[PDB]
Every structure is written in C-alpha cells, then in structure tokens.
Amino acid sequence: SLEQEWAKIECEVYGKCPPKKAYYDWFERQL
Amino acid sequence: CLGPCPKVCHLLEGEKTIDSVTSAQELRGCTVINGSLIINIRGGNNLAAELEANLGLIEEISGYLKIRRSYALVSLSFFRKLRLIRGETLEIGNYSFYALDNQNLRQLWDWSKHNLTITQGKLFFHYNPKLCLSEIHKMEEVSGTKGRQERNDIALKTNGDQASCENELLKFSYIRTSFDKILLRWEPYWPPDFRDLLGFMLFYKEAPYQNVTEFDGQDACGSNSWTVVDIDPPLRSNDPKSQNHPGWLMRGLKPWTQYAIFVKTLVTFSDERRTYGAKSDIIYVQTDA
Amino acid sequence: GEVCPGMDIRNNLTRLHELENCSVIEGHLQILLMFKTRPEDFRDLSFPKLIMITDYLLLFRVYGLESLKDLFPNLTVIRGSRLFFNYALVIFEMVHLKELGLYNLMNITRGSVRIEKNNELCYLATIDWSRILDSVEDNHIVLNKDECGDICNCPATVFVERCWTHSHCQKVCPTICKSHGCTAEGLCCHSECLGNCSQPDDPTKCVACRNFYLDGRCVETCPPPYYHFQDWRCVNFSFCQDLHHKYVIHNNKCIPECPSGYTMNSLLCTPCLGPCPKVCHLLEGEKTIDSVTSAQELRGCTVINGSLIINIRGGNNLAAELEANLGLIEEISGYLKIRRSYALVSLSFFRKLRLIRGETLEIGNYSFYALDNQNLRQLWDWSKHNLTITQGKLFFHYNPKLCLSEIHKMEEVSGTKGRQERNDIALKTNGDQASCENELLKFSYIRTSFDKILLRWEPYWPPDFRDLLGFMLFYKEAPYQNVTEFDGQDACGSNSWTVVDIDPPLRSNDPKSQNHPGWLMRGLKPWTQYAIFVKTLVTFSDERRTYGAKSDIIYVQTDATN
C-alpha cells in the first residue's frame, strides 16, 4: 500500500523505523 | 554652463515632506536637493507617474531620504536618477536612508541598473511588508554602507513579510497518487550548513483550475489558502550521492480531485549572506479515481 | 552493603572504581564501548559484593574480557522493572567473550534475554532458562557460535546436562524449592526467601528476596508507616521526603509523581480539597509561550506565580491549543505581555483569566503589555469577561487590528482607569487598520448623471461639533455589488477606494441641523456602477465617545450617453 511504502520511507529518511528496529535505533544513536 | 551648474533647491529648515502631486511638483527639476526629503504618499492611488515627472530629475539629496507610510508606492524607482544621498543632515539615529511602514513597497531602485551612493549615515528598514530582504541587502552594498560597516537598522522579521525570495528551486522527483493519499518526494536540498534546515513545509490546496499562485493567499490581499504541513528535516547522509530524496504522504484527500501543491524550506538566519532557502513550483496532482 | 544509583560507565576504569564497596543498585548498569580493555586488565578485577541489579545489565563491545564468572560472580536475581525494549539481559557484539560464567543466576522476575551477533561465545545450550525465566517464549538467542563442545555431577534437564562453565554446574534443586531458595544439601529456605540462603528456614539470612526488604528480615509487604519503594525495599516517610527536596505519597507508596487525576497537596496525592488551587512557579518569574509545547507546560496552571510572555509566531493559529492549555489560568501573579502575535486574533484563549496581580511588572511599571501583535483583533469579550489588575499600568502599541474600543473597555474593567494609571496606549498605532465608526450615516438624496453623481447624506455632529474635522467620501468602481466593507486596506481587487476629504458644513438654523452635507463626484465614466460610502473624520479625545459615523456601501450607477 501507499502507507506501507511511506512506512519504509519514514525509517529510511526520518529514522522512524518499526518498534522492532527501535532497539537497533538506540545502538545507532549511541556513539 | 561650462562646468556643473545644477538647480539647487533649498528646503525650509532642511526638510520637505512630499505627500501628494503638489508637494512633488514643488521639486520639479530640482536636480540637487539641499535638504532632507520625506515621502509620505497617502491613498490607494499610485502617483508614481507624477512622482517620476517631478522627482525623477533629482540626482542628489544633501540630507537624508525617508519613505514613511507610503501606501500605493510599489517602487522608489520614480527617483529616476537619484545617485547620491550625502546625509549631511541625518534622521535621528544617524540614518541617511529611512524606510518605515511602507505598505506596498515591493522594490527600491533597480540595482541591476541604478546606482545610489551614501556619503555618510546608516540605513533603516522596518515594517516594509512586500519589500524583500534581498532588495535591501543589495542597497547596503551599492550605497557603500556595508563598505564602511554601517550598523544598519534593518530588522529581518519586519521586512519581506509577504514577499518570497527563494533563489533555489525544488523539483519533485516522485508523485504517486491514490484516491485519498498522495506520496511526494522532492529533490534533496541542504544549505551550506545542513543544520540550518530546520525542516520543510508542504503547501497543498485543492484547485478548481491550474491558475493558483503562491503569492496569492500568502499576501494580505488574499486569505491564506494552503495546507501548511511542516516537515521534519531528513537524517542527512555523509555521502552526497546517498542523500535520499525527502518526502511526505499527505493524508485525507478526496477522490480524483486536483490538488495544487508546492513545498518550501524553513531555513534559519545565518548572518551576513543568508544560506538561503528553496521553494518548489506549484504542481497539480489529480489523486486517483 | 551500600546503596548506589544507576551508573553508565563506558571506557572508564576510573569511573568503575566505585562498585568495590556497593551491593545493590536502584537502576541499570551499562558497561559497553570498552576497547582499551585487555585480559590483563580484567584478570585483576572482581566485584563479589554486587548481588542484584534492578533494571537490567547491558554488555557491548568489551574487548579483552573472556569470562564474566570473575567480574560479577555473586549476581543471583534481577528484578527487571525498567526493561531495555522488553529485555532484561543485553548481550550484543561480543567479539572476545567465550562464556557467560554466571553460575549464581537463579531466577528472573521480569524481562527477557537478548543474545544476537555474538561470535566465539560458547556454553549457550547448557543453560536452562525455564527454571530461571517464567516465559522463555520472548527469548531471542540466535547468531552465535554455539561447534563448541561444552564440557560440564551437573544436573540434567529437558536430557542435556546443565552447566555454566567447565568447573561450575547449574544449581537445580527439586520442586519443593521452586522459588524460596535452596542450599547445597537440598533444603528449601524461608517461605519469603529467594534464590539462595546461608541457613535454611531463616528470613534474616537471605541476600535476595522476592518481596520488599526491610531491616534484614525480608517482609511480604511493607508495614505502615513504611512505604513501598522500587518493589524491593521499604523506606520510611522521612526518607523519600528528603529525596523529594533535592516524591509524593500514593497508595501507601511515596512515588515520584502522582498518576493521572491526582496532585501533591501541601505529599499525599489528592485531587480537590475545599477550593482547588494549582500554583505553577516560573523560573526567575517569567515564562515565554511561543509554541504548543510552551503552552502545554502551563496546562491546568490555574494560578501563575510569575509573569507570562506570549510570543506565538507564524501564520498558523494556535488559539485552540492555547485555550486547551492556558484557558484554565485564572491568575497571573506577574505581568502579562503579548508580543509579535502574527496569528493570534484574540486573547480570549485565556478563557478564565480574571486577575493580573502585577506583583512583578514589565519595565515601565506595566502589568499588561501588548506590542506588535499583527492580527490581534480583540482582547477578552468584555461583554462577558472580567479581568482586574491589582497594580501596574497598561501598555498597547502597534496592534494594527485591535481597535481602541477594546483597549478602552479594558482600562475600565482592569481598574487602571479607576486608579488613574497613566497607561501608555498609543492612540494612533492600535486599531489604525480597522475602522470602528459605530454610528451610521444614511444617504438622504442620490442624483446621478452620465459623468457625475450628486450625493447627500444625513447631517452628523459629535457631542461637540468642533470635534468634527470633516467627512471622507470613499468611491470605487463596482461592476459587481460584492464590494466588501472598507477594512483599512481597501479591497484585494486592483480597484481601490478613492478617498475624498470633505470639510464639514456650516452649523446653522435649528438644532435639527437642517444642513444635509453633500458632494458632487465628477471624474466618472458612463454605464459604470460605483460603490460609495461616507466616513466621518473626528478629533479623538478623552471625551471617549467621539468614535464617528460611517455609511453602508451603496452601489450608485451613472447614466449612459453615446
């Protein structure tokens, strides 16, 4: 769907990745 | 004559207020003004034609030049050959050029053609809603004030409220359409310093015809007719060739209705020459059936 | 032992030199990003005093470390209240670790284990998480080395032997010692005990307890007046009160903040006692509201113990959010200042602001201040609203659309005029863009020509006819009778009002004023329809009523000639 394509985009552009990747987001934020 | 012999017109107590045609005609042919000039044109009727016929021969002002509460005057170019403001007398605050509350002033002189040096005194610009900052900044450089580091009192917030001066142009690289949602992606834009991009701001308005203008609505003339969807700045990549095209999915649209859309950058001031901002053209998207 | 807060030490042995004499931590311990660390560094490091970590333990890229059995040997239980994204044990990117080594782990109260992308780690399949964790369904143990050849006397559960290292087995005791603990001989500890004990059937010999710890002997629940704290200890009322003063009591537990629908009453969380007052104290007596977030910080602050500055900017009106947040403020102890309000058309979002005490004042002894508000059209609805000022002056400048009628009504409601405050209200910077003529002029007589229109209207004079400076006839082309009223900027269409000043007629004859003023427009075009109205021009003064009169727009037409 269009929303699903933007769902990926939000993670890709704004770093708004799914709650499953929120854990990975912290490691990227660290250091 | 052999050698210069200009028509010097001496002003009472060093000041003369030009309000109407009669006040301007009193300076007809006064190629040199031995005093300060105040322009206070009143009334929704533009007198630029009569002002140029009368004031358009002035080439020097020995005092300051002040334009205050000029409503219908969209341009100071009626000073067709004003090349010098000596500033021997100054407006309080050591100003040699003064511009206040001029409601429809869009431009000064055409700095692509015109020259206007100021021998002394500062520049003043406040509450000129249409006059762009760029128009004023070019004067600071032509007038020599910047060449002598004059602390010109030109408030950024008070001038160019209605105008738009985005030299950079945004181009949409992706326009997907659904019956109630449109996915857009424009080019990546970054100021010299990427942190100056506080964000984007989408502007989409449903348009009956493809004749909508950004200045319409933004100006006081027309009520604002755009959806100001502010957008966060993208997570910048180190590689310039890996800068993903930012975008937005605007929601809640109507089936096969044409929307007029453009996107603009929110860039903070950076002092001296501004890093500048970008704005896209108006694009029309029909959504989908 | 001692009590220590949560510490986050990265690449800092000096910062580490703090857990040598501490036992418990009321937070999370994060040892990570250690690259300088070496095996030689670790071989002489041991912390046997630590027993239980409340939140979680996180290990990341710790070089030189090979086994944790010597660093933290006496770790038994982990509470797991605050989880790191629903995880209680974080083991990520361990390039030098060989085995866990935690041979004292007994049970996990809450949380999961996270083991991913860990190379050279062994002894992973020999750990029985079922006897340690209640729900091992959320366990994520993948991407590891475990052929390892884990060589363990050790108990075997569902059958594979369970052990942590090559010389330490896994403590697996029978069903009767399910959670109360277990000794080396096989006797369960006290009913309140947990994990392990030194003497069986003794609540004063257990270092780890499921319930709350208080005075050595662990207690099932905290007896009054001991309030629960963190679910593991029972602190007194005076203890958590001192922590609040550089914590509020709720349900026999002094928690940091009250839940939704409660507040501290001067500790106990209660919502309304008699009259309900909320006092919000501002830093250095001033708070600037420019965005929704700044306004939301004052949500429900019925009484502002400071001065308030409104600096909303941009064309987007926040009046709805301002009323949801500021609309409960009923007192401002300082001054109230509105500045550069480009979009805010009304201050009525202060839905119930009744008082501005002006205890602190804006420089110039002002209690209300209004400057440069571009679109402010009205204050409060003085037909309904009340707003007293205890002290301080009024200030109004450069409010282009705020008519002086709204300002003058404030001077009377606020009591400033009732105490003769020399209010700094600029008579010709506020409401200049808005015509507020309240009386009406009617065109008594219309006569038109192909080139001219002769108009007369009813006579008008202020209470003092000398205050009449004249009239002002506005006329403009109107091919369609849609011309909106003159709003200080003519119309958006290119056609603009033509302003004709008209000196007033002679005061004559009866007090009926039988001198109907008139004007003859002459520069007009045939066939053409013109919108015309007349406005008065009147000397404003402290007479406070010479507002003047204005006509409605009339759409007269000229005649048509060849």
Residue numbers in the entry:
A (entry chain A): 1 to 31
B (entry chain B): 304 to 592
C (entry chain C): 5 to 150, 154 to 159, 168 to 173, 178 to 265, 277 to 296, 299 to 594
Manuscript text:
We show, using single-particle cryo-electron microscopy (“cryoEM”), that IM459 cross-links hIR domain L1 to hIR domain FnIII-1′ and, in so doing, releases constraints on the membrane-proximal hIR domain pairs [FnIII-2]-[FnIII-3] and [FnIII-2′]-[FnIII-3′]. The resultant three-dimensional (3D) map displayed pseudo-C2 symmetry, refinement with imposed C2 symmetry led to maps with ill-defined receptor domains. We thus undertook focussed refinement, masking the region corresponding to domains L1, CR, L2, FnIII-1, L2 and FnIII-1′—this process resulted in a map of ca 5.0 Å resolution (with detail in Methods, Supplementary Fig. 3 and Supplementary Table 1). The map was then interpretable as comprising (i) the four-domain [L2-(FnIII-1)]2 module of the receptor, (ii) an L1-CR module, adjacent to domain L2 and with domain L1 in proximity to domain FnIII-1′, and (iii) a considerably more mobile [L1-CR]′ module on the opposite side of the two-fold axis. Two tube-like density features were then visible, sandwiched between the juxtaposed surfaces of domains L1 and FnIII-1′. Attempts to improve the resolution of this focus-refined structure failed, likely due to flexibility in the linker between two components of the peptide and the resultant slight mobility of domain L1 with respect to domain FnIII-1′. The relative disorder of the [L1-CR]′ module and domain FnIII-1 with respect to the remainder of the structure may reflect individual IM459 peptides being unable to cross-link domains L1 and FnIII-1′ and domains L1′ and FnIII-1 simultaneously; alternatively, IM459 peptides may be able to simultaneously cross-link domain L1 to domain FnIII-1′ and domain L1′ to domain FnIII-1 but, in so doing, destabilize the central [L2-(FnIII-1)]2 module. The relative conformation of the focus-refined hIR-Aecto domains reflects that of the insulin-bound receptor, in that the L1-CR module is displaced away from its apo-interaction with domain FnIII-2′ and directed instead towards the receptor “head”. The relative positioning of domains L1 and FnIII-1′ is, however, distinct from that seen in the site 1 to site 2 cross-linked halves of the three-insulin-bound structures of hIR reported recently.
The human insulin receptor (hIR) is an [αβ]2 homodimeric receptor tyrosine kinase that upon insulin binding signals into metabolic pathways that effect glucose homeostasis. Insulin binding brings about extensive conformational change in the receptor extracellular region that in turn effects trans-activation of the intracellular tyrosine kinase domains and downstream signalling. Whereas biological activity of both Site 1 and Site 2 peptides in isolation is minimal, [Site 2]-[Site 1] fusion peptides are IR agonists, with the most potent reported being S519. Here, we present single-particle cryoEM structures that show how a 33-mer polypeptide unrelated to insulin can cross-link two sites on the receptor surface and direct the receptor into a signalling-active conformation.
